[PDB]
Amino acid sequence: LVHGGPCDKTSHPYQAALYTSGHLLCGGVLIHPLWVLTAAHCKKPNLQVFLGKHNLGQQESSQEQSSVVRAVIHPDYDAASHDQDIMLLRLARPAKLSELIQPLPLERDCSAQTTSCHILGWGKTADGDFPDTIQCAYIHLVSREECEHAYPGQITQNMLCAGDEKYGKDSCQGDSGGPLVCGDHLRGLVSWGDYPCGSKERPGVYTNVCRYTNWIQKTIQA
């Protein structure tokens, strides 16, 4: 996450850190004590989910760890175009909820109003390093027509765009699968965007969570 700052340690209880090979790979969102929602491009072997993390460089009293039982990628995910970039992870152990570990409710309304949003993650910052402390930024939803011109032929109905025209606040590598929060609801998941990270010119592209209500329900009930 570029051009942001450290989060208030009590503001992100839904945030998950996804590790493979001992390093941070992706973010994720706790949506149910047994499930974390992330991007399908985060599928890697032996994912380890960390809940209640703020600083990755220190052992915290709030942190919980879980292996993944199964990873459920959306049947229509297209890695070439990033279309339907969503995956459900079933936790081996139900998340022990606290004031620092809580699920985030999903936005089910695709017409939903709220344009003022926020992003968070442990992805690459402006200096190019991977921060130990989670980063936050307030960003705004970018209209469908405007995102379509930034990335011609690349934006589907399963994607939402968001960014910051003023300073370029944007998600980055490592933020993938993290949340786009609008009106205290999960509106999107970090999917892709511009290279290098920064949304001054072209906005960040997010998986449109409202489109997956049925599939998320059906997966959780399976």
Query: 41 or 95: whose CB is closer to ligand J08?
Result: 41
Q: Does 209 bind ligand J08 (CB under 6 A)?
A: no
Is residue 145 close enough to count as binding ligand J08 by CB under 6 A? no
Q: Does 173 bind ligand J08 (CB under 6 A)?
A: yes
Distance of CA 193 to CAs 30, 96, 180, Å? 23, 34, 14
Region near ligand J08 per CB under 6 A, out of 10-18, 149-157, 192-200, 212-220: 192-200
**Using rule CB under 6 A, residue 197 touches ligand J08:** yes
Contacts of 25 (CB under 8 A, 6+ apart): 18, 19, 42, 44, 47, 174, 176
Indicate the residue whose CB is closest to ligand J08.
Answer: 193
Paired residues of 139 in beta bridges = 117
Which of 31, 172, 182, 216 contacts ligand J08 by CB under 6 A? 172
Question: Is 12 in contact with 27 (CB distance < 8 Å)?
Answer: no
Strand partners, 36: 30, 89
Per CB under 6 A, residues contacting ligand J08 are: 41, 79, 82, 170-173, 175-176, 190, 192-195, 197, 204
